[PDB]
Ligand binder design. Structure first.
Ligand SMILES: [Ca+2]
Ligand SMILES: [Ca+2]
Ligand SMILES: [Ca+2]
Length: 292
DNA sequence: GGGAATGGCAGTATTCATCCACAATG
DNA sequence: CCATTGTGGATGAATACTGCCATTCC
């Protein structure tokens, strides 16, 4: 119904989007499909409808029982996508996929995808995108087709990008701290953003960008990702809450953030060190995030 | 006529979000 | 002792990404 700010959109797409190139055999026996996909939980369908209304393109289809996808594949409508990301460009390593997506779009625009020479170029493009070439494409186009591509290294452009990106990757936690001495718990606010190590430079930059926090790496067990993490309450209350109050979040995570700010006000006013304050904080923790 | 383009999903794989422990710190 | 803060553990599902048959269009 409502349209999303374009820089929030790009932030959310850096978080949740996918740029795809699919090349399939007919058994001109290769057709090629170029596609932008956002797949979210059903609860955030309105995000997709809001992107769909901001672009005036794309279809929305259910994606199994619990998810839903916005899909742009119609060739003419991809110009809308490309226009958007030229004015408001991605900054994660996904930017490399979008560039390859754009390069493939030129091949198809010049009607070259249908010719043998075009297919071979599109195969080279697809090898560098996302998870690379399928086994069938590898059987049909043998050899070691290069997967290498330039590393993206861009800085956060503004807080509206951050807001869109955090709407996708962020976590606003109310955490109860247990101790050895007794059964009484304390409360801690946690802000986190997770991301694959491939964007280690962007993640590191959040420390200076937001003026607080840490990066932690987790390697459980042969997977690797990074955690931007903030727990110190003054940093939460003075540095994190203002940013996202000025730069509004989208989706259901907006509600979790608002419940988060409620707890933070209770902590700000020392109401959390009272049995009634803590009781209410517990109630909130139960009905947000995974409890919502 | 027919096959390319597009719709409409369901399926696969993993990168996230999320709740959590407990040591450290003052 | 209490309260806060640091440093991740662990888990599984909401993501990212892919696959395929049906319908539309040229
Ligand atoms: Ca992501
Ligand atoms: Ca998300
Ligand atoms: Ca995500």
């Amino acid at each position: 119904a409502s349209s999303i700010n374009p820089w929030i959109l790009t932030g959310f797409a850096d978080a949740e989007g996918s740029f795809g190139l699919y090349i399939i055999n007919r058994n001109i026996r290769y057709t090629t499909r170029l596609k932008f996909t956002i797949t979210l939980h059903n609860k955030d369908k309105s995000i997709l409808e809001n992107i769909q209304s901001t672009w005036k393109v794309g279809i929305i289809a259910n994606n199994g029982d619990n998810a839903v996808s916005l899909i742009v594949t119609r060739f003419e409508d991809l110009k809308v996508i490309i226009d958007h990301f030229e004015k408001y460009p991605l900054i994660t390593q996904k930017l490399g996929d979008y560039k390859l997506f754009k390069q493939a779009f030129s091949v198809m625009e010049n009607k070259e995808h249908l010719k043998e020479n075009g297919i071979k170029e599109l195969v080279r493009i697809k090898a560098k995108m996302n998870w690379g070439l399928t086994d069938e494409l590898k059987k049909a186009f043998p050899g070691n087709i290069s997967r290498e591509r330039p590393l993206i290294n861009k800085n956060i452009p503004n807080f509206k990008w951050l807001a869109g990106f955090t709407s996708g990757e962020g976590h606003f936690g109310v955490e109860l701290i247990k101790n050895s001495r007794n059964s009484r718990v304390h409360v801690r606010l946690r802000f986190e953003i997770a991301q694959h190590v491939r964007d280690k430079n962007l993640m590191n930059s959040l420390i200076t960008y937001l003026g607080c926090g840490y990066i932690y790496e987790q390697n459980y067990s042969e997977r690797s990702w990074l955690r931007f993490s903030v727990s110190k309450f003054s940093d939460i209350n003075d540095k994190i809450i203002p940013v996202f109050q000025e730069n509004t979040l989208i989706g259901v995570k907006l509600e979790d953030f608002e419940d988060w700010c409620k707890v933070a006000k209770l902590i700000e006013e020392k109401k959390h060190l009272t049995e009634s304050g803590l009781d209410e904080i517990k109630k909130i923790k139960l009905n947000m995030n995974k409890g919502r």
